[PDB]
Design a protein around this nucleic acid. Structure first.
Lengths: 102, 50, 149, 207, 87, 126, 119
RNA sequence: UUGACCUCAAAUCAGGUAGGAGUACCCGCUGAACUUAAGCAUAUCAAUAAGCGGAGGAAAAGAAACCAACCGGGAUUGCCU
RNA sequence: AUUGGCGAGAGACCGAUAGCGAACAAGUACAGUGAUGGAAAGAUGAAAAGAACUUUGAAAAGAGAGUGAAAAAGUACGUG
RNA sequence: CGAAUUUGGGUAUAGGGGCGAAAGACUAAUCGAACCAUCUAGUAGCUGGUUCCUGCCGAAGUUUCCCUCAGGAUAGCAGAA
RNA sequence: UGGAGGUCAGUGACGAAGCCUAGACCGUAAGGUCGGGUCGAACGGCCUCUAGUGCAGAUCUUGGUGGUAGUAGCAAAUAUUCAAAUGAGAACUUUGAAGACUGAAGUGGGGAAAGGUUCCACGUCAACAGCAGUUGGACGUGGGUUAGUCGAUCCUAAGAG
RNA sequence: UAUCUAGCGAAACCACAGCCAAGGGAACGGGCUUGGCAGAAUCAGCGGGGAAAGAAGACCCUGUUGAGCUUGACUCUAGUU
RNA sequence: AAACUUUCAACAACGGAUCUCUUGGUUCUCGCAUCGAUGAAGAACGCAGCGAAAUGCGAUACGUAAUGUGAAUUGCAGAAUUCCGUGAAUCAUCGAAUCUUUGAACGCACAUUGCGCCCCUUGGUAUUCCAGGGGGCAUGCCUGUUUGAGCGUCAUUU
């Protein structure tokens, strides 16, 4: 998803799926959606992806694979990675001092 | 260098215009902190490394 | 590096905690901003009560099952038993939980009674016409306090 | 600033250079080049133990402890001896606590409020303020604390019917709700016995 | 003589002027600037270079365009023109 | 005191605003109080200084000396009134800087915007 | 002295450009005269007048071009409004307010009601 | 012969879009070592700094393939515990 | 959440060897091939009223005179 | 001192790398591991320093253990409560 | 000692702080006070609070100043002298006269690299030239670089890309 | 050259300074004690002394400090099979 | 005895300590979201009557237009009934343009102000050569248009 995204930087990576596989390569068909095409800007069932917050969602790790890699799942299995392991790590390593010390 | 690039010869020009003393009517201006040409450069003292 | 009768003090500061310290000087400031946010939300959505109506549910675990508390929302079974539709309840300001299930009669009786006394205590403006001048109350939870059985 | 005394690339030359082991600025041809830095003893170096934000600024105090102090401060205002010692011109005041009619709460204009304060006996104290306005001693006078002055009577009310606005502008005298009754003005400088003017309603509400 | 006799042989130019950063830091044999990273599109800057960022950051120079955008947004990026003639 | 949070009671910020205010802001900072009579027939306590107004000096060494404005020297927060100079020992006459707050406006140069300036402040234009 | 913008806008194209040449001539006459006389600030006036004139010529042409492209799509990139790169890639107000038919059906059916409690 | 279609091209084709800056915060990847262990190798520093990629006013997460074992709670986030 | 940007307000903060490196033409002068390194330097007087003029000296300048409240404030200028 | 010659310009090799008719030589006065910046205020049982007065009390270099013998822990001596 | 709350309706342009004082007094001392001189704008006593709070040392940091000391030194490149002029002032400027030297792999005439206006003229000697200076590659003000043929541009080399 | 003069004019070093013998002393004192003695200020040399200066000794020891290198030290590892 | 050394005082020096001030910093809080292929950040070179900086700006160059204010700027010079005014200002505001050469830089290139090509137009006798002026020519990707390629393949036609 990343190499496709950086190749066609004018498209957002909707998803990707395994299509085939051999000894030394894996093959994926990457679903791309053009955010600057009026057809997709309209039909607000899909106009969420042309929102600027969704550009290059594969680089940030927001597609299905990105969610899997970061381990962003509900459960006790994912106690370290529930909202982002760096946020949780920063959450539980901060020294939260108050005006009136506890 | 007697055979110099033109972009060097622009470095040449502002070197010569800047290498002149502070105008003497600046003193007379009100609340003038400026006293002398601090950025003054001389070929005898320091090189301009282009 | 250890001496005398002193307790072993497990202090977790081997890390560079200094860059990650967060001191809450803004505790006073955030309180004023939050009160301002409550003020502006109430002014925006007046005269609705600035908050939803929560059901009264029994806390889990053996430790806290002796106390009821405001849950998330009324289960769909409770909403229909009050004589409503889930969508209509959301608009009129009733918090609705779809994933909670009613398995206790006493809790169910309290919630449907909570809804019935909520309906009789609110008024709803019509979509079309001159809405009656109503005075905004700011706390649905306070007007219907959670009661220990 | 956390990076004070550290926006530098200093590094010690070690021994064998007839100079101290304090780290020194590299480079050359600056005057700053080859100068000590990074230490607490160096010009331009960091301070020893840089002051940090997480120092305990506010102090927890037991609620019963604060209320205990407020009760003592209030009881001190009834002692005419303490008020005189604390520096309030109450020598000619016929009665302490000085209680006025509750109509003072309804006074809207500063002219009538100060006129009442003159008559009820707080005249001398109000003259002691607004004549003691002295320029603050020391570097604090250009940190927005330029002027110092004494504190006048503390007018205590029950319901702000305009008394707070009327006396808001008068130097020294400050208004305090009987419900609140903050200690920081009942015992300024931890000195008991602040001259307090009580209104009739606030006195009743006190019990 | 590795010193003053050798310093005499220093009459060439390892670096020349870089068209991007304008510093005398454009290596000639490497055909790349050592300060701004010319000709690479990304402007060479590192977090470990805390000061070097400060030297060549936004706000260092003129701000031809970015200077006015704060005012433009403040008014709302609004277009058109004013109406009232004069006093 | 300062109740509206927007205005600043900082000495440094107030002094910086004064010493770096532009020409437009300096004009209102160079306000001049009207005389007892000029107040009576206009009704305005003070008016911004103007290049062609007759003024009176009421404070300083120049106390009591009348004059007419020759140049509002806004750059120094000062005004240059005619006939009130100090002779340099060479014989040259250099004008005295004066702050307008120390001057009393004895007469007004009434231009049509000034007539609007008096009306907007509550003046009867007598 | 010097010419002023408001009367210039009245003048048509050809004579506005004609006087542009006139100002450019007289600026040249002062430019050669500046090196002779020790002080000549009048060049400032004509330089300012030149900028005023050709500012109007550029503006008049642009107003005509807007007239050329009035109400027709695909305005030239300099004529269309320069808001912000982020804004021009951002969704329009009509387009953000666009909703699917299923969503709009629910909105009309069950809108956010207005209500209050009489306590 | 002539029309298609499928795939793959070209065009200074019509219309668009990406790059770069900043980077305090945020999302990932990569990733040390000094240090501590009175030595040092697991460990620690640290799933950190540096490096790289990507956005916004916040971002991320987010409406359970959840926690529980209770008279059960009920998206996510944050604070006190 | 936020030590970036813009705007705003405060401080039991520092007060020109401090506080940002930078109160000032500061990331400036300057050094390095380069990556980079990187200073010092505030205050006359209310206002220049910045010492007209005379004399000695080639001149600087001094001595006088003079301004100025003060020249034990003369731009090498708060105090020293 | 006519060639394994010398030298100019261009060019290539970049740090655990380069190059070396080999000395651990040279690699911008830095070489048995360049320079620069950051992690970094790295570490140290080691050296030096450690800023006012007066009053009262006032030692120790020993026990045991330790990769311990330039140090700690423990007991001892001391002060204060 | 720096600052904070209170108080003395404290002190102060008729002089606060500061600084100097082989002048006085108090305290064992840390220090405090007063007198005298300069000085010009704020500053104290007491009850508490707070800290970036007390220096002789750290081959301490920065800045400055000493003895050394009018000392070492200004001794490679064989060497200068006389007169006149300018100029206040000449060992050093200019001219002339001599005397010399580099001795054509020169201290000459040009250039590549590099430098960048030093080239040239006029005015001038506050700094600089190791002494001096009237001179200057210094200071101030200006002037100065003309190409169809000289090169770059074009070509390719090792290479880079 | 040194020397002297005219002009210009540093640096190293420096607790304070600069007479010895003997004693003792941290066991080789300019200072302490006992004696000898001791008369301003100096100039040129000089090389006895100031355990003279130049470097937190480079030789040696210690450090639970490193680094270069080596190997049938221990543990791994690219590569290859 | 002087000279010299040492000590102290007065005055004078060297030096910038102390004290006082502060358009600066720092920390905290609050609010907002705002760069760029419509060309960003940065840089280079220029622009003022007399400017080297700083500040501002770009051959429209310490800026022009629009708006508000209402009579200046200021060191000198100059202009200044421009003054009862669509009108001064190194004014503010800022919505229109200009914005050199660059720079993600975008015709190729760059240690060069190099080399180009296309269109329109003006001139030199000129579709072709040389100039002038104006406008263009980057890469990747998307939608569509046109022209296409492939016995990949279908139908049709002898």
């Amino acid at each position: 998803e990343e190499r496709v995204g950086r190749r066609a930087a004018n498209l957002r990576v909707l998803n990707s799926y395994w299509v085939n596989q051999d000894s030394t390569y894996k093959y994926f068909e990457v679903i791309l959606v053009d955010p600057q095409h009026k057809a997709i800007r309209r039909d607000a069932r899909y106009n969420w992806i042309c929102d600027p917050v969704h550009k290059h969602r594969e680089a940030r790790g927001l597609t299905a694979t990105g969610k899997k890699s970061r381990g962003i799942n509900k459960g006790h299995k994912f106690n370290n990675t529930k909202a982002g392991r760096r946020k949780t790590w920063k959450r539980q390593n901060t020294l939260s001092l108050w005006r009136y010390r506890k | 260098a007697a055979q110099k690039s033109f972009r060097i010869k622009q470095k040449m020009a502002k070197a010569k215009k800047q290498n002149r003393p502070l105008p003497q009517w600046i003193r007379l201006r009100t609340n003038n902190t400026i006293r002398y040409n601090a950025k003054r450069r001389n070929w005898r003292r320091t090189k301009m490394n282009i | 590096a250890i001496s005398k009768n002193l307790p072993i003090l497990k202090n977790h500061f081997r890390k560079h905690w200094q860059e990650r310290v967060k001191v809450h000087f803004d505790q006073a400031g955030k309180k004023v901003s939050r009160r301002n946010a409550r003020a502006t939300r109430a002014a925006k959505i007046a005269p609705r009560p600035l908050d939803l109506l929560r059901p009264v549910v029994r806390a889990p675990t053996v430790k806290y099952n002796r106390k009821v508390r405001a849950g998330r929302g009324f289960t769909l079974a409770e909403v229909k038993a009050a004589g409503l539709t889930a969508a209509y309840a959301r608009t009129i300001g009733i918090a609705v939980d779809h994933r909670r299930q009613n398995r206790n009669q006493e809790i169910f009786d309290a919630n449907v009674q909570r809804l019935k006394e909520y309906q009789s205590k609110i008024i709803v403006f019509p979509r079309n016409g001159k809405a009656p001048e109503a005075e905004q109350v700011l706390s649905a939870a306070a007007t219907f306090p959670i009661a220990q059985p | 600033s956390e990076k004070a005394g550290h926006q530098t690339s200093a590094e010690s030359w070690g021994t064998g250079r007839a100079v101290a082991r304090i780290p020194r600025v590299g480079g050359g041809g600056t005057g700053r080049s080859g100068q000590g830095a990074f230490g607490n003893m160096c010009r331009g170096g960091r301070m020893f133990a840089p002051t940090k934000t997480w120092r305990k600024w506010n102090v927890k105090v037991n609620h019963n402890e604060k209320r205990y102090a407020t009760a003592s401060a209030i009881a001190a205002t009834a002692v005419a001896s303490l008020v005189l010692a604390r520096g309030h011109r109450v020598e000619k005041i016929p009665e302490i606590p000085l209680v006025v009619s509750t109509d003072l709460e309804s006074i809207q204009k500063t002219k009538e409020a100060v006129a009442a304060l003159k008559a009820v006996g707080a005249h001398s104290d109000l003259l002691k303020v607004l004549k003691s306005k002295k320029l603050r001693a020391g570097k604090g006078k250009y940190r927005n604390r330029r002027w110092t002055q004494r504190r006048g009577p503390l007018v205590v009310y029950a319901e702000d019917n305009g008394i707070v606005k009327a006396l808001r502008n008068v130097p020294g005298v400050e208004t305090a709700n009987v419900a609140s009754l903050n200690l920081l003005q009942l015992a300024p400088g931890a000195h008991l016995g602040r001259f307090v003017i009580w209104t009739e309603a606030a006195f009743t509400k006190l019990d | 003589g590795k010193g003053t006799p050798s310093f005499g042989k220093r009459h060439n130019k390892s670096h020349t002027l870089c068209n991007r950063c304008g510093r005398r830091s454009f290596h000639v044999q490497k055909k790349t600037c050592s300060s701004c990273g010319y000709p690479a599109a990304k402007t060479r800057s590192y977090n470990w270079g805390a000061k070097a960022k400060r030297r060549h950051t936004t706000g260092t120079g003129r701000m031809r365009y970015l200077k006015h955008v704060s005012r433009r947004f403040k008014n709302g990026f609004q277009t058109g023109s004013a109406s009232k003639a004069s006093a | 005191a300062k109740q509206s949070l927007d205005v600043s009671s900082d000495r440094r910020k107030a002094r910086k605003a004064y010493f770096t205010a532009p020409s437009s802001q300096r004009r209102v900072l160079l306000s001049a109080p009207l005389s007892k009579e000029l107040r009576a027939q206009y009704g305005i306590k003070a008016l911004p200084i103007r290049r062609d107004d007759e003024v009176l000096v009421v404070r300083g060494s120049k106390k009591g000396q009348e004059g007419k404005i020759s140049s509002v020297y806004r750059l120094k927060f000062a005004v240059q009134v005619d006939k009130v100079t100090k002779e340099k020992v060479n014989g040259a006459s250099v004008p005295i800087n004066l702050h307008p707050s120390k001057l009393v406006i004895t007469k007004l140069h009434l231009d049509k915007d000034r007539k609007a300036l008096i009306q907007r402040k509550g003046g009867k234009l007598e | 002295a010097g010419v002023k913008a408001y009367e210039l806008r009245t003048k048509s194209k050809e004579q506005l450009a004609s006087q542009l040449v006139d100002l450019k001539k007289e600026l040249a006459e002062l430019k050669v005269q500046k090196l002779s006389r020790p002080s000549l600030p009048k060049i400032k006036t004509v330089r300012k007048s030149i900028a005023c004139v050709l500012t109007v010529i550029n503006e008049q042409q642009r107003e005509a071009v807007r007239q050329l492209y009035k109400g027709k799509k695909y305005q030239p990139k300099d004529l269309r409004a320069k808001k912000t790169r982020a804004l021009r890639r951002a969704l329009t107000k009509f387009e953000a307010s666009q909703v699917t038919e299923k969503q709009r059906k629910k909105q009309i059916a069950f809108p956010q009601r207005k209500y209050a409690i009489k306590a």
